[PDB]
Amino acid sequence: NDRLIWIDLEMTGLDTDRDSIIEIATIVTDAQLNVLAEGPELAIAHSLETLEAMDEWNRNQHRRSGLWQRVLDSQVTHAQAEAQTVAFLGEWIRAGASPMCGNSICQDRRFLHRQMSRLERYFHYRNLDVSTIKELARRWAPAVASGFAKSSAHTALSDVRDSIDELRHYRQFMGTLGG
Ligand SMILES: [Mg+2]
């Protein structure tokens, strides 16, 4: 172990039962949050009809980021993206060792469970959600949030990259627990 798998996904919506994963990205860091390697960043093939069926903020966001065009042009399926990610991970850590790390990852895990089971099982059942710390800061030390801002970026790779930086930021104000 001593290595963490960070992941983030983009979806068509919020319904963990109906919506679909359209983009995925992973990053492996050591226990001290140093990036060791960036995994494949894949947009997943979906029909134009599926994209227009999304809400409004969703459509605008993905349009502006360019993900909308990557999805239509993509030739990668859920199974293909799953296989490549698992292969990437296989070169850094054995299955079942690392918790799933990121922001609001419970939501992500529920999507993986349905569309990318093999990848879901590659994770330890434990989650490492930066949101938990964000919630505590918000209630106990509001000022601590003022020092961090998320990247302008939009892709999943920058999002996961921001999650690591966010924890890295909070760690400075965690005292003894921060190490
Ligand atoms: Mg996310």
UniProtKB/Swiss-Prot annotation:
The keyword Nuclease applies. Residues 4-167 form the Exonuclease domain. The active site is at Y125. One of its GO terms (biological process) is DNA metabolic process. Belongs to the oligoribonuclease family. NCBIfam families: PRK05359.1. This is Oligoribonuclease. It comes from Xanthomonas campestris pv. campestris (strain ATCC 33913 / DSM 3586 / NCPPB 528 / LMG 568 / P 25). The gene is orn.
